Curated annotation (Swiss-Prot), chain C:
It is found in: Mitochondrion matrix. Homohexamer. Organized in a ring with a central cavity. The ATP-binding and proteolytic domains (AP-domain) form a hexameric chamber, while the N-terminal domain is arranged as a trimer of dimers. DNA and RNA binding is stimulated by substrate and inhibited by ATP binding. Interacts with TWNK and mitochondrial DNA polymerase subunit POLG. Changing residue 118 to A/S: Enhances the basal, but not the stimulated ATPase activity, and retains peptidase activity. The chain holds residues 771 to 947 of 959 of the full protein. Residues 1-171 form the Lon proteolytic domain. This is Lon protease homolog, mitochondrial. Coiled coil: none annotated. The gene is LONP1. The active site is at 79, 122. It comes from Homo sapiens (Human).
């Protein structure tokens, strides 16, 4: 965020100062002598590297400081945020108790970001309203419970309740990857009309997703005719498919597994088992190709009360490098074909 | 590539097999130049498979979706036209190409093969990989024979004029 | 709407019923300057009305025009789902809705009602438009009871989760 406008351009001065081959002779303007600056440990913070000129980016060791997941945020809140806020507001544990579960709920419903300042703001808000209740003589000890949190921080920015806690036939829960990361969506399927049948698709209209849903529907029809031959629903019926619009184009087509599961669940009239989210692109033969954003997809699975997720087989290494707090309570099934997903949905 | 010679696999697959004609979805190298090159190569592959084995309707209605890896200078990019035509024809006929074979060259709309650049880099890349046969534009034979004898000793080179000759030496 | 909540009337009405052969599909023409998401949601509402009326063939063998007036902000686009479904159902069944009845709430392909925004603004507009009964999604109950005591005085309210209940109280 250095000025590069009309008056001056101190970026060249920094380019001469932060050069390891010219630090040994700095030569500022006041002193005509050169000063050795080779032992100074320089650190430069930036929000984005794009606005750093390339000869200056080339002189620095670019280290990326990424954000924290909900568990790291909880550790930060317990160890630093809540104690420092207690000290700054003059309260203790006996006057106002922030427990780990109410802090988890706060982080989950309100502080869904990469940094920590917003979580600190929420912590200060809770302790501050507590202090006002105490000073005004209303109470002498406030208790913040996951039911009493609402009247402290307001309306939850994100909803814990999902569209379907129990899914009827036709709708299957799939999880996606957005620019905010970690989204869960219900792929839905119904029928329009009461001798060839057709598919009408709505949602994230993308030219490649069109063909993706087409071949997913074709494989679904073929798989149905080979698995249960005396069933003609998916061939003689006109149906409607709907895919929610969370996934970015790259992983737009990553919902083929869920689409096939939805079409088959509707045609069979048997609901899919509960708390089951799935991912994976299908080929024509039913090959399950690898998908991206497994970290975000797993965090979404966790937040949406899912237990058993289904991933492509070749994302095994991508998954088993995710921390234990990210994947501890999850039971994962890795599949190399659609028959195995069919078994996983009973 | 900007780092030197390289060896990439041009890959065509199938997806979603009289009213419609099979499209093609290029995914690897984006840019208008390589886009038009892929279009020209697709059209020539279609015409070639029409006048040769005129029965199979594969290349006309298939929705191929090839993929060309991303490493190449924007000037050398169109030198994958003959490779693309050969990948398309191989997928269509269901016959893999000759095993240890590398090829480069620009293809015209009627199949004429045009000269390319980076002959030494491409040759060294093919030799570093396992390649015993190389196919080059006939107008690059001077550039090929200027190289050192310890580079171009273990590979047999075929200097082609028109893509019918690549179809001959590739199947 | 932008800085306000003015209530709207969706209306319905294209070729006349042929009554010759029940093999056709019937169609819905939608207007009202819809964004892409709004058009997709109106299509979903069409499909759900067609499926709900499984009982007759007015949705499946008639060509219909749907008009949803402009003013709803693009975020608040699909909040007219239950209103669209009710309009279609009332046109089919040939009977009006309750005389002073306003509704809002997104509808999914299967009938689940999703929460909406601007409950305060929509409520103010409903009260100023003479509306006495108002139908809201269930997840907006806290949002509605976080209002003042005069934003709702003689306003009959119904919180719902599935469209069958909206249908019951609208007819």
């Amino acid at each position: 965020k250095i000025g590069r406008g009309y008056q001056g351009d101190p970026s060249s001065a920094l380019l001469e100062l932060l050069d390891p081959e010219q630090n040994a002779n700095f030569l500022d303007h006041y002193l005509d002598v050169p000063v050795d600056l080779s032992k100074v440990l320089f650190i430069c913070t930036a929000n984005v590297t794009d606005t750093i000129p390339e000869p200056l980016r080339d002189r620095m060791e670019m280290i990326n400081v990424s954000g924290y997941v909900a568990q790291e945020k909880l550790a930060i809140a317990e160890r630093y945020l809540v104690p420092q806020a207690r000290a700054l507001c003059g309260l203790d544990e006996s006057k106002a108790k922030l427990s780990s579960d109410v802090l988890t709920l706060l982080i989950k419903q309100y502080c869904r970001e990469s940094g920590v300042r917003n979580l600190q703001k929420q912590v200060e808000k809770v302790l501050r309203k507590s202090a006002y209740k105490i000073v005004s003589g209303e109470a002498e000890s406030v208790e913040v419970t996951p039911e009493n949190l609402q009247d402290f921080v307001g309306k939850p920015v994100f909803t814990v309740e999902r569209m379907y806690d129990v899914t009827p036939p036709g709708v299957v829960m799939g999880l996606a990857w957005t620019a905010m990361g970690g989204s869960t969506l219900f792929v839905e399927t119904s029928l329009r009309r009461p001798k060839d049948g057709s598919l009408e698709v709505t949602g994230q209209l993308g030219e490649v997703m069109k063909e993706s849903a087409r071949i997913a529907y074709t494989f679904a029809r073929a798989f149905l005719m080979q698995h249960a031959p005396a069933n003609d629903y998916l061939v003689t019926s006109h149906i409607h498919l709907h895919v929610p619009e969370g996934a970015t184009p790259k992983d737009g087509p990553s919902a083929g597994c869920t689409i096939v599961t939805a079409l088959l669940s509707l045609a069979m009239g048997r609901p899919v088992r509960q708390n089951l989210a799935m991912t994976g692109e299908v080929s024509l033969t039913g090959k399950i190709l690898p998908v991206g954003g497994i970290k975000e997809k797993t965090i979404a699975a966790k937040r949406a009360g899912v237990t058993c997720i289904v991933l492509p087989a070749e994302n095994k290494k991508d998954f088993y490098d995710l921390a234990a707090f990210i994947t501890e309570g999850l039971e994962v099934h890795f599949v190399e074909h659609y028959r195995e997903i069919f078994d996983i949905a009973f | 590539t900007a780092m030197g010679g390289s060896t990439l696999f041009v890959e065509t697959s199938l997806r979603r097999p009289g009213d419609k004609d099979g499209s093609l979805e290029v995914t690897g190298q984006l840019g208008e130049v390589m886009k038009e090159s892929a279009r020209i190569a697709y059209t020539f592959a279609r015409a070639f498979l029409m006048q040769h084995a005129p029965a199979n309707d594969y290349l006309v209605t298939s929705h191929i979706h090839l993929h060309v890896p991303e490493g190449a200078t924007p000037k050398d990019g169109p030198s994958a036209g003959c490779t693309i035509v050969t990948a398309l024809l191989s997928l269509a006929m269901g016959r893999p190409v000759r095993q240890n074979l590398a090829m480069t060259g620009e293809v015209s709309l009627t199949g004429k093969i045009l000269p390319v650049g980076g002959i030494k880099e491409k040759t060294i890349a093919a030799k570093r990989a396992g390649v015993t046969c190389i196919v080059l534009p006939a107008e690059n034979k001077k550039d090929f024979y200027d190289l050192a004898a310890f580079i171009t000793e273990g590979l047999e080179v075929h200097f082609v004029e028109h893509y019918r000759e690549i179809f001959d030496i590739a199947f | 709407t932008a800085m306000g909540g003015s209530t709207l009337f969706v209306e319905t009405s294209r070729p006349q019923d042929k009554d010759a052969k029940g093999d056709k599909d019937g169609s819905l023409e939608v207007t009202g300057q819809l964004g892409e998401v709004m058009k997709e949601s109106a299509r979903i509402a069409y499909t759900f009305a067609r499926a709900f009326l499984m009982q007759n063939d007015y949705l499946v063998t008639s060509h219909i025009h749907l008009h949803v007036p402009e003013g709803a902000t693009p975020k608040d686009g699909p909040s007219a789902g239950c209103t669209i479904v009710t309009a279609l159902l009332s046109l089919a069944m040939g009977r009006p809705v309750r005389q002073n009845l306003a509704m809002t709430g997104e509808v999914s392909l299967t009938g689940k009602i999703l929460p909406v925004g601007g409950i305060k603004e929509k409520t103010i507009a409903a009260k100023r438009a003479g509306v006495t009964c108002i139908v809201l999604p269930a997840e907006n109950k806290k949002d509605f009871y976080d209002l003042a005591a005069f934003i709702t005085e003689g306003l009959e309210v119904h919180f719902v989760e599935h469209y069958r209940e909206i249908f019951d109280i609208a007819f």
